[PDB]
Amino acid sequence: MVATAKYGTPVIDGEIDEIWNTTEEIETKAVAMGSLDKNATAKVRVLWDENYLYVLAIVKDPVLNKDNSNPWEQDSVEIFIDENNHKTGYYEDDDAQFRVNYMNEQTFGTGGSPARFKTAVKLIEGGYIVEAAIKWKTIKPTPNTVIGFNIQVNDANEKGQRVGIISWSDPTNNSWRDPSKFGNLRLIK
Ligand SMILES: OC[C@H]1O[C@@H](O[C@H]2[C@H](O)[C@@H](O)[C@H](O)O[C@@H]2CO)[C@H](O)[C@@H](O)[C@@H]1O
Ligand SMILES: [Ca+2]
Ligand SMILES: [Ca+2]
Numbered sequence: 261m262v263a264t265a266k267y268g269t270p271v272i273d274g275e276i277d278e279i280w281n282t283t284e285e286i287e288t289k290a291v292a293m294g295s296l297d298k299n300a301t302a303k304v305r306v307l308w309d310e311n312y313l314y315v316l317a318i319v320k321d322p323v324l325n326k327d328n329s330n331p332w333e334q335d336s337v338e339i340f341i342d343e344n345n346h347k348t349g350y351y352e353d354d355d356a357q358f359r360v361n362y363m364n365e366q367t368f369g370t371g372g373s374p375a376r377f378k379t380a381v382k383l384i385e386g387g388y389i390v391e392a393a394i395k396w397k398t399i400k401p402t403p404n405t406v407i408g409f410n411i412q413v414n415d416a417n418e419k420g421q422r423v424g425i426i427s428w429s430d431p432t433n434n435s436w437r438d439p440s441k442f443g444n445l446r447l448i449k
């Protein structure tokens with residue numbers, strides 16, 4: 261429900277900056293489809309500065325696949341932001357869904373834009389690391405500012421079928437259209 265992100269500016273390249281160690285790690289344990297022991301999950305660290313929100317997601321996934329024509333059905337990570345944290349039941353102008361797969365290919369849901377999304381992906385033993393920067397659209401964050409946030413891992417099998425949907429705050433697979441399913445992220449100094 262609630263987490264924090266330390267102020268900081270990491271380099272987007274898929275490598276783990278020392279600074280990521282200064283912020284808490286959250287886990288995607290809100291299951292909508294699949295299970296924690298059998299499907300893709302991520303260990304996530306979050307940082308922020310006046311211009312972007314930064315996300316480091318270490319994904320556990322032994323089988324990588326992107327054969328499905330649906331981007332949400334390819335092994336990928338989705339990031340959700342609610343800048344004014346209104347927790348509405350639908351997307352406002354400030355709300356957004358961003359997506360990037362293990363090949364660092366970006367796709368977008370409502371509100372998401374490539375002009376505000378920089379990403380890098382590096383494969384690792386047993387999975388992959390996603391490092392992203394999301395440019396704020398409507399706000400200029402200050403310490404103790406609270407935004408709505410969620411991160412989801414889509415797990416596809418060798419058959420190109422999505423078998424897992426696990427996020428941090430949403431076990432109902434509605435984050436793509438319902439910000440009220442996002443958790444709260446306090447931007448701290
Ligand atoms: O992302 C835009 C796209 O979303 C599709 O819904 C996905 C959603 O993106 C994802 O977060 C969730 O896990 O799965 C649903 C599908 O069940 C939606 O169907 C598209 O119309 C829309 O363009
Ligand atoms: Ca880095
Ligand atoms: Ca909003």
Ligand SMILES: [Ca+2]
Pocket residue numbers: 300321322323324325335415416417
């Ligand atoms: Ca997979």
